[PDB]
Each structure stands twice: as C-alpha cells, then as structure tokens.
C-alpha cells in the first residue's frame, strides 16, 4: 500500500517540502536519505511514502511540479532538497501568472504529459498502489489550474484509485492577487467531482491563528506552513505508524464520506505552537473541538457534523481520552447528526510529533464548511456581475458560460450542505 505524492505550484511545493521535512524527522531519515533512528516502529511503514533505493537509502515517492523554476530551485537548495529523486522535478519556464486558464488549458496542458510520465514510473514500482495525495493552492494558476488538470488526467489512467488533496483556500486577508476568487471557484468544481477527500486549509484561519492566538504581529507564509505541515503529519499518522488500526485510504474514505460530493473536511490541531507545560487530556479534547483550532474559517456551531475523527499522539490514558471524548459529545450533542450513529472516531498513536509530549489532530466533515464556499462565491459574484478581470481568461480561450457553470455548481454544493444541515431523523 504505497502512496504517490504530488505538489504543484508555489504554495503546493512549499507546504509539501515542510511536510517531507516533518515526517522525515519522525521516521528518522536524514537530509541525505540515510536512517539514523532508534526504534523499528519508524520503518515498519516507511514504504508507504518512501522507496528503498540502492545503499539502504530512502527516497520520497513524491513528484514536484511547477510552471516556473523559481520555487523548485529553492526546494532543491532547501534543508531537505537533496532527498527528492532528481528526475521527479518537472517544471516549465513561462509560468501561469496566477491564471487558472493558463494552468488548466494552455501552459499547463503543454507540460501535463511530462508529469504523468513520472507518475507512471512511480506507480509501476508500487507493489499495490493505494492512491494519490496532492498539495496545492486554489488561488494561483499552476497549483489551481494545472493541479486540477493533473487530477482529471490521473482519474483517467487510474480510475479505481483514491485521489485526495490538501487544498489551501484563498482569503483577502492573505492575498497575492484579486482574481483569486475566480481561480478558486473554477478549481472547487473540479474537486467536487474528482477527489475523494479534500482537506480545506483556509489561509484566513491560519492568519487569525498566528495573529490572535499565537500573538504573532507579522505572520509570514512560513508561519502558516508550520501549522499546515503539523496537521498533515497528524492526518497521515494513522497510515505512517503501526497501531492496531488497519487503515487504508479507501477504508478511511468509506467511513468519512456519506455522500460523494460532500467530502470537504475541516482540519484541526492542538496544542497550537510556534511552551513546556504538559497539556492535559481534557485540555487536548476541549481545544481540538474549539473553533479557534480549526484550519477552515467556519464556525462548527453554525452547522452539524456528519462524521468526525480525532487522532491523539503520545503516551496517555487511552481510558481518559474515551471519557473526555465521550464527555465532549454531550457538550455539543446537538451539533452531531443523529441519523449516522456512532459517527465519531478516535485513534491513538504512541509516537509524538517533534517537541511535543502530546498532540491531537482533528478531522471533521461538517456542513458548516458551507460557510467557506459562500465566502468565495460572494467574492466571485462581486466581480463577475461586472465581468471584471475576465479578459485575463477570455484571452486564453475560455467562454463566460464556463464561469457561470462553475458558479452554479458551487451554489449547488452550498445548497446540498444546507439540506443535510436541517435534516433530522
């Protein structure tokens, strides 16, 4: 059960690099690819994300994609730059200019075949491919436009494999350009059809967390990516380390996705870091269900949970987590749908993340994620009703009905979340 990782664009490759830095440290792999760890539990599932190369060297099963070489050159020079397989760097020269059309139709189409070639070589070397994960942003052009193009191409060649994504949603408080709502709306319509799980990482929340909670006056993209890498590590701990949980991507999707289109999750993490005081199990459970620890700028009390999964890391009383986990149920029992019995899952991993005795990762399938899509839809319509900045896209061959269609599909997605939010037994 191997996973193939893909990171596309500026945002996708930076959060992807941090990810490989974090889990590489947890598995005991050094920047050169040599193992110098203390426990054999680190290696029992190293194959899930790493290939074993000549010389007992471990190489991430990762593909790096971008339409301009800038960020990828930085990655090759970064701390863990030399660990990636050099032939897995696939880049163009021009770029996408924060244009979904360039990444999806013109500039990205020129490069997509070359990317799929590397996918095949990685998949052919898989004993039993389990699925794919993609890291990318939805506000730019390469990760947004070409990223969804890659997903459509992968579902063509591997139609029976799981396709999941860690997608960074744009926010005006952290914005590079104004056409970000356009690109996001066009990308989400693709994710509704061609992904099994999409973790909605909202830059609005990451900023509010760095500023309000962590008290960071001037947050940088590096500060936000520290939160993202920690969460992705927590989400993947159920596959990367050997508990008595037989977790496969498809089995996890079956347990979390009651309806095919409603597969957009709210990530969460606790404690929030950037101290030494030991955190208590009651504190971990109370923080991980708090809105201030959510990676999507949505209020869970404004919607209802379809399914929930809590992952605890460290050595703690498995009895005490159950008591506190069962306790929190009552404090928000109204916010859990009663027509999916026992819809809250709990997993425990004995291995803690770096420099934390105990941590908790939160994955929620809540109808309150609808708030995020409304926000993007509003920003979209504010411009589209005046056809502002459309020339950037029509110049690349797109028609205006493609914008209208994408708009309607997201409003449909919003309405679908609303019917189940009001549904009762």
């Amino acid at each position: 059960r191997e996973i193939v990782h893909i990171q596309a664009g500026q945002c996708g490759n930076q959060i992807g690099a941090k990810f490989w830095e974090v889990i590489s440290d947890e598995h005991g792999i050094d920047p050169t690819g040599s193992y110098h760890g203390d426990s054999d539990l680190q290696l029992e599932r190293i194959n899930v994300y790493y290939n074993e190369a000549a010389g007992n060297k471990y190489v991430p099963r990762a593909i790096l994609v971008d339409l301009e070489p800038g960020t990828m050159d930085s990655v090759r020079s970064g701390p863990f730059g030399q660990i990636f397989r050099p032939d897995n760097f696939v880049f163009g020269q021009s770029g996408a200019g924060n244009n979904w059309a360039k990444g999806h139709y013109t500039e990205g189409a020129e490069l997509v075949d070359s990317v799929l070639d590397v996918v095949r070589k990685e998949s052919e070397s898989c004993d039993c491919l389990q699925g794919f994960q993609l890291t990318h942003s939805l506000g730019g052009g390469t990760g947004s436009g070409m990223g969804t193009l890659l997903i459509s191409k992968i579902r063509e060649e591997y139609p029976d494999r799981i396709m999941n994504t860690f997608s960074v949603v744009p926010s005006p408080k952290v914005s590079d350009t104004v056409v970000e709502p356009y690109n996001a709306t066009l990308s989400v319509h693709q994710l509704v059809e061609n992904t099994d799980e999409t973790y909605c990482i909202d830059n609005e929340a990451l900023y509010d967390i760095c500023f309000r909670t962590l008290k960071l006056t001037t947050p940088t993209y590096g500060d936000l990516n520290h939160l993202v890498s920690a969460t992705m590590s927590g989400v993947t701990t159920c596959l990367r380390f050997p508990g008595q949980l037989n977790a496969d991507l498809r089995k996890l999707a079956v347990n979390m996705v009651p309806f095919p289109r409603l597969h957009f999750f709210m990530p969460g993490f606790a404690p929030l870091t950037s101290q030494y005081r030991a955190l208590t199990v009651p504190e971990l459970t109370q923080q991980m269900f708090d809105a201030k620890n959510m990676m999507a700028a949505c209020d869970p009390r404004h919607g209802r949970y379809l399914t929930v999964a809590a992952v605890f890391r460290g050595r703690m009383s498995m009895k005490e987590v159950d008591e506190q986990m069962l306790n929190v149920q009552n404090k928000n029992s109204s916010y859990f749908v009663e027509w999916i019995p026992n819809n809250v899952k709990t997993a425990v991993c004995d291995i803690p993340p770096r420099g934390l005795k105990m941590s908790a990762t939160f994955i929620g399938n809540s109808t309150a994620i609808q708030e995020l899509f409304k926000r993007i839809s509003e920003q979209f319509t504010a411009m589209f009703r005046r056809k502002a900045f459309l020339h950037w896209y029509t110049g690349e061959g797109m028609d205006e009905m493609e914008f209208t269609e994408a708009e309607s599909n997201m409003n449909d997605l919003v309405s679908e979340y609303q019917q189940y939010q009001d549904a009762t037994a």
Partner: protein, 61 residues
C-alpha cells in the same frame, strides 16, 4: 486552446490588413495632393507662355 490560437491569429490578421489599408490610402492621398500642386503650377506656365505669345502679336503692328 484552439480558440485561443484563433483569437491571437485574427488579432494579427486584422492588424496587418488595417495597417496596410491605412498606408495605401495615405500614399494615394499624398500623391494626389502633390499631383494637383504641380498641375496647378504647370497650368500657370501655359498662361505664362500665352502672355508671351500675346505680346508677340501686337509688336507686329
């Protein structure tokens, strides 16, 4: 992508034609101006040759 190519090419086509059109009409107009200027001056020279000839008839009197 075919549409994108179609639009870039047409924009080049329309530009090339409209430019060629403008600079053929302009060549015609400037030539027609100087042609009329010279034809006016040449018409002056006829009246000049006529004035010389009218003096030549009365000195034969």
């Amino acid at each position: 992508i075919q549409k994108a190519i179609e639009e870039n090419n047409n924009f080049i086509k329309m530009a090339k034609e409209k430019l060629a059109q403008k600079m053929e009409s302009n060549k015609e107009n400037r030539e027609a101006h100087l042609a009329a200027m010279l034809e006016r001056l040449q018409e002056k020279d006829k009246h000049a040759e006529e004035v010389r000839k009218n003096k030549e008839l009365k000195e034969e009197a």
